Amino acid sequence: IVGGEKALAGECPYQISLQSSSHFCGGTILDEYWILTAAHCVAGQTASKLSIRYNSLKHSLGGEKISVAKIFAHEKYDSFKIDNDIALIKLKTPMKLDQKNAKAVGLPAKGSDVKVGDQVRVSGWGYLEEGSYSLPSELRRVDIAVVSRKECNELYSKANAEVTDNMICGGDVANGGKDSCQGDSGGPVVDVKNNQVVGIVSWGYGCARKGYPGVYTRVGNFIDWIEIKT
Amino acid sequence: IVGGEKALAGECPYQISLQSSSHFCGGTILDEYWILTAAHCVAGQTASKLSIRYNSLKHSLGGEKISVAKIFAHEKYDSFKIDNDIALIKLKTPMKLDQKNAKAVGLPAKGSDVKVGDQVRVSGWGYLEEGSYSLPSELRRVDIAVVSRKECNELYSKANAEVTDNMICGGDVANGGKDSCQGDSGGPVVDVKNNQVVGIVSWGYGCARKGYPGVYTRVGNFIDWIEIKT
Numbered sequence A, B: 001i002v003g004g005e006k007a008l009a010g011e012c013p014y015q016i017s018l019q020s021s022s023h024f025c026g027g028t029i030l031d032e033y034w035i036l037t038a039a040h041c042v043a044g045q046t047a048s049k050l051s052i053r054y055n056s057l058k059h060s061l062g063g064e065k066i067s068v069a070k071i072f073a074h075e076k077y078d079s080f081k082i083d084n085d086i087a088l089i090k091l092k093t094p095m096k097l098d099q100k101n102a103k104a105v106g107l108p109a110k111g112s113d114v115k116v117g118d119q120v121r122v123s124g125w126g127y128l129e130e131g132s133y134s135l136p137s138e139l140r141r142v143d144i145a146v147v148s149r150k151e152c153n154e155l156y157s158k159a160n161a162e163v164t165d166n167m168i169c170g171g172d173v174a175n176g177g178k179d180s181c182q183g184d185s186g187g188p189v190v191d192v193k194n195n196q197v198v199g200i201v202s203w204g205y206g207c208a209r210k211g212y213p214g215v216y217t218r219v220g221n222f223i224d225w226i227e228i229k230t
Helices: A149-159 A219-229 B149-156 B219-229
Strands: A015-020 A022-031 A034-037 A051-054 A064-073 A087-091 A119-124 A140-147 A167-170 A188-191 A196-203 A214-218 B015-020 B022-029 B034-037 B051-054 B064-073 B087-091 B119-124 B140-147 B167-170 B188-191 B196-203 B214-218
Touching: A015 A034, A022 A051, A022 A188, A022 A196, A034 A196, A119 A196, A149 A167, A167 A196, A196 A219, A214 A219, B015 B034, B022 B051, B022 B188, B022 B196, B034 B196, B119 B196, B119 B214, B140 B149, B149 B167, B167 B196, B196 B219, B214 B219
Parallel strands: none
Antiparallel strands: A015 A022, A015 A051, A022 A034, A034 A087, A051 A064, A064 A087, A119 A140, A119 A188, A140 A167, A167 A214, A188 A196, A196 A214, B015 B022, B015 B051, B022 B034, B034 B087, B051 B064, B064 B087, B119 B140, B119 B188, B140 B167, B167 B214, B188 B196, B196 B214
């Protein structure tokens, strides 16, 4: 997370750390058994080899670790376009929720989107700057403004990339400096007001660059897919 | 502000910049005519040497500038102890409130306090770290944990300083890294949940050093004092 601040106890209770030997991606608690993350995070991984840490502001210490039992990556996931970039994880044993740093987040209405002027909170243990040498140990969080789909799409032409109906953007076009980064991927993007996960940290060009908003998977487009799979 | 993030549109609509040719202190909109700040900001200053900038996330650009007409420094302000460190300012002309970036914040109940477990948001244009001699141009906010009076008192009980009953503390005692700093003085300390200003940025030893938390004036102890003057 770039341009964020350290999360406080109970601020982002839905955040999980997805791990294989150590942290590589974030995830969002949907219930006792089910974690939401990115397809690109779980793509060609073995469930048996992945775990999560929940209930902790530190990725490598505290809370509790659970084995993953199941990986569900979107069937239309395109690794080249990073489209349909969503995955569900099912855990081998339940998380104890309602627990201050362990609490589920809500799902938005089916087919909803964000609009310019919405603010959203993005959290995780990713780099503090594009290309730092280590992950912070403490959870960061950042509030960023949503960027119109059309505008974000137009900015990313310069990089030859499309932003689709399956994606939302957020960040600061003019100045950069707020964003998710490497390690943040599959992490939550939350409407705090309504307590709803609206996005997944997905991709972008570098981190926090001027003109290059972070792109997030638009959760409103997979409400179908999530409720079936669970 | 150290260890914070750029306030977004609408997040800190009660922040003002108090200025003498340029910014040197913060303050909080109580209503159209009234600004709460620190006695140490206004003491031995002439009202009509002073102006505020409201309705901007920038201290030197934007919003509107309004002249000060009156200064009420607390009659028990002790400048050696920085105790009773509260002032009220009345403006020459009213602020247009109920804007995106201009609203009043509320006052806590008479005699209230903060406890361990509470978090408060501190905002302003102060230095982004200790001794970095330049103001950010954009408003920052940080959320800190409350530190008990007792603990804070023991922590300062070592720089020969006393945290009195008229004072509350915030900071990270383990890590430091989150604090107000120079230029942030008189700025608001808010309980975001209830939309109440419970503190005024008062004093500290350095900025964001662990075991030297930021010390704030305890607004709950001046509720009588404020409501009378207005």
